[PDB]
Amino acid sequence: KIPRGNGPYSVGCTDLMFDHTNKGTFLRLYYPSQDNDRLDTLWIPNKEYFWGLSKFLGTHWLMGNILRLLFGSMTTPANWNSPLRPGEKYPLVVFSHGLGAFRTLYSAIGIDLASHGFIVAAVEHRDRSASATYYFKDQSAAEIGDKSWLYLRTLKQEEETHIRNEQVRQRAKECSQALSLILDIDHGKPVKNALDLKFDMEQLKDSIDREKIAVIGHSFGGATVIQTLSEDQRFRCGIALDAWMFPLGDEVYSRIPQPLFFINSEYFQYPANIIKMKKCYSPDKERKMITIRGSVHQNFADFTFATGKIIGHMLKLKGDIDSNVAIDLSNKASLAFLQKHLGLHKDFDQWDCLIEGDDENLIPGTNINTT
Ligand SMILES: C[C@@]1(c2ccccc2)CC(=O)N(CCOc2ccc(F)c(C#N)c2)C1
Numbered sequence: 001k002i003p004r005g006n007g008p009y010s011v012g013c014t015d016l017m018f019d020h021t022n023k024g025t026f027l028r029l030y031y032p033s034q035d036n037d038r039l040d041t042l043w044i045p046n047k048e049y050f051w052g053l054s055k056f057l058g059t060h061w062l063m064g065n066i067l068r069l070l071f072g073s074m075t076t077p078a079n080w081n082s083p084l085r086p087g088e089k090y091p092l093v094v095f096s097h098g099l100g101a102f103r104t105l106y107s108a109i110g111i112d113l114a115s116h117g118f119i120v121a122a123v124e125h126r127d128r129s130a131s132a133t134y135y136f137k138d139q140s141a142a143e144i145g146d147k148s149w150l151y152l153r154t155l156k157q158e159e160e161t162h163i164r165n166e167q168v169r170q171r172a173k174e175c176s177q178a179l180s181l182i183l184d185i186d187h188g189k190p191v192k193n194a195l196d197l198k199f200d201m202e203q204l205k206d207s208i209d210r211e212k213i214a215v216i217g218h219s220f221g222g223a224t225v226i227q228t229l230s231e232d233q234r235f236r237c238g239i240a241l242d243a244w245m246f247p248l249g250d251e252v253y254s255r256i257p258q259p260l261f262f263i264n265s266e267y268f269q270y271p272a273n274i275i276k277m278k279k280c281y282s283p284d285k286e287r288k289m290i291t292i293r294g295s296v297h298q299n300f301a302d303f304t305f306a307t308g309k310i311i312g313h314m315l316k317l318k319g320d321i322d323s324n325v326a327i328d329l330s331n332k333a334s335l336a337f338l339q340k341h342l343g344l345h346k347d348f349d350q351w352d353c354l355i356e357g358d359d360e361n362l363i364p365g366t367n368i369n370t371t
């Protein structure tokens with residue numbers, strides 16, 4: 001089981017696609033909801049996502065069917081299409097998934113943030129970095145739910161530099177576009193969700209605190225954080241969770257005016273990657289870095305909660321540290337950073353110590369030596 005948020009709000013969840021095309025925005029929303037008795041949200045909602053995951057892992061598409069059999073009725077504790085909690089403007093987080101992931105696999109993080117009073121828009125990227133995603137080829141296909149699927153693009157070695165950069169820039173634009181969509185919806189622009197879901201988007205009118213916007217992401221999504229920030233001044237800070245820095249152009253390192261927090265796993269990182277993180281540092285710019293002791297790269301995503309301790313450790317979904325303990329540290333450090341850099345009037349400053357790595361399960365800065 002994926003854990004419930006620790007904050008005082010109930011959390012709801014829905015999906016938004018607009019427009020219906022492969023250049024439109026596709027996101028999963030997590031939001032503070034009213035009390036309700038709605039069903040929990042289906043974690044991986046389509047069989048095609050499991051086929052995509054199979055391709056990502058480099059196995060037979062038949063392994064997709066086994067993953068589906070195993071994980072396909074699993075839920076995450078957000079209430080599907082529950083009404084939005086009225087009477088408050090919420091800060092907004094745009095969330096970017098990793099390579100071979102997709103919008104639904106960072107619910108542990110999304111739910112927790114929402115439970116403390118954020119709206120979270122988890123984008124699904126159409127750069128062919130998602131294991132799978134979908135769109136509709138025309139209006140009629142949208143109306144009848146006739147999906148067209150795009151699966152992960154596998155690259156030759158020779159393409160990696162150029163295409164990964166292409167992808168991160170597209171990811172950035174997708175983050176910007178998703179923000180613009182939510183801002184339009186906030187202002188009251190009618191939006192026809194290409195998904196025909198029973199969640200009225202008019203609820204979100206006047207629900208967004210328009211100036212308090214952050215971008216957060218895992219691995220590829222962490223590089224996405226940095227690109228988005230350099231390109232789009234509406235995002236006031238970023239949190240990169242175990243950023244994979246490789247996709248970023250050399251030009252961007254010196255072009256990130258906003259506060260930026262690096263939260264790393266112990267075992268993922270390596271000098272080449274850390275050096276690039278360090279290139280973002282400058283005495284006029286706000287940067288923090290911590291490393292979660294005993295943690296692995298997948299501690300930041302939901303599959304860390306999907307298996308037992310032994311199978312999970314063997315698969316590198318779990319580290320030495322307990323997955324709940326790890327994500328709690330990342331989530332609370334994140335909340336303190338956000339309160340400080342969006343100017344929130346909450347009690348997240350209670351975890352200010354975590355930003356400085358001041359906890360028995362954290363390492364201030366990094367364990368990686370780079371001299
Ligand atoms: C491919 C990466 C990598 C780069 C260099 C070396 C090693 C790995 C870059 C990247 O974005 N990564 C994160 C991918 O996270 C995922 C993928 C699929 C999932 F189902 C879930 C879940 N839950 C999470 C690792």
Ligand SMILES: [Cl-]
Nearest residue numbers: 037038039080
């Ligand atoms: Cl329901």
Ligand SMILES: [Cl-]
Nearest residue numbers: 267268296297
């Ligand atoms: Cl790892």
